Design a protein around this ligand. Structure first.
Ligand code: HSM
Length: 297
């Protein structure tokens, strides 16, 4: 039977298409963040060249972070952190100025968030929070949304982790940017993305995939579910919870950016890795569809 080969090719292509969809979602947010970081660095340069004073600058940044978050209802939070005195050399003047995005040490450390689109509240991140290395569900340090682009000089897409919005703990990922001046990192900017958005993405793609007869899952590099059309209760959970026998193999395939098909009863599984942004560690889509659907009516 040459039936099995056509079923494999179809699912491989479906796996590729689903990865394109997830990649586009991440890349749209990456575009938006990259464009806004230029606005941040320009304002910083206007103040460095004394065309703009520090009080107006910190006010301007604080307002424009909020406006840029309000403009993208796909984004959960927007944070901006500068190294000490690296925004304007004037941190000492803004100690405990949260209405100007300045924290307990005057460092410009600003967050705007919208738990639902439009309920914009703000926080100035204190030093102990910027330095909190507590391990999360993936093993990664809590403050990787700050230290990751600062250490590499490159953007990062964190594994799912819990963070505070309002006074609730939400499960999320972030696209975090280094703010570089002449090849040196002077600060960090980042977009927070509610994992419920990726859960919706995996459900919507499953509906378009043979009328939802199978399932679509989204895997972060560390192997946490960022989306699972069959059970949202798997958000933030390790792949071994749903796929113990192949968890280990699936994760090394993922990290090596290798695709693979799996035969199981009369169902097919495909793991399709994907880079969410350029150079990022591969995420993946896991697709399972019964063979009878692939060789459909
Ligand atoms: N969500 C990562 C940025 C942040 C703001 N407040 C706490 N953490």
């Amino acid at each position: 039977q040459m039936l099995d080969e056509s079923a494999r090719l179809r699912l491989e292509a479906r796996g590729e298409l689903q990865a394109l969809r997830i990649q586009r979602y991440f890349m749209d947010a990456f575009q938006y963040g990259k464009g806004f970081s230029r606005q941040i660095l320009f304002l910083r340069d206007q103040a460095q060249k004394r065309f703009l004073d520090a009080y107006d600058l910190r006010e301007d940044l604080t307002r424009q972070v909020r406006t840029a978050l309000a403009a993208n209802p796909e984004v959960l939070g927007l944070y901006v952190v500068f190294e000490p005195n690296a925004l304007d050399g004037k941190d000492e003047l803004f100690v405990d100025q949260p209405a100007l995005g300045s924290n307990d040490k005057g460092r410009f450390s600003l967050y705007w968030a919208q738990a639902t689109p439009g309920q914009l509240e703000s926080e100035s991140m204190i030093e102990s929070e910027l330095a909190d290395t507590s391990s999360g569900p993936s093993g990664a340090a809590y403050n990787a949304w700050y230290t990751c682009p600062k250490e590499s000089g490159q953007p990062c897409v964190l594994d799912p982790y819990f963070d505070k919005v309002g006074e609730r703990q939400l499960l999320m990922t972030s696209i975090a940017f280094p703010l570089e001046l002449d090849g040196k990192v002077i600060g960090v900017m980042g977009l927070d993305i509610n994992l419920s958005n990726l859960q919706a993405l995996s459900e919507q793609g499953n509906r378009e995939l043979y009328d939802g007869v199978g399932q679509v899952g989204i895997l972060s590099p560390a192997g946490l579910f960022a989306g699972n059309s069959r059970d949202a209760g798997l958000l933030g959970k390790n792949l071994a919870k749903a796929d113990p026998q192949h968890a280990g193999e699936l994760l090394q395939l993922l990290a090596a950016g290798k695709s693979r098909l799996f035969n199981e009863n009369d169902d097919l599984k495909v793991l399709q890795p994907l880079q969410p942004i350029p150079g990022a560690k591969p995420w993946g889509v896991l697709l399972e569809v019964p063979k009878s659907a692939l060789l459909g009516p």
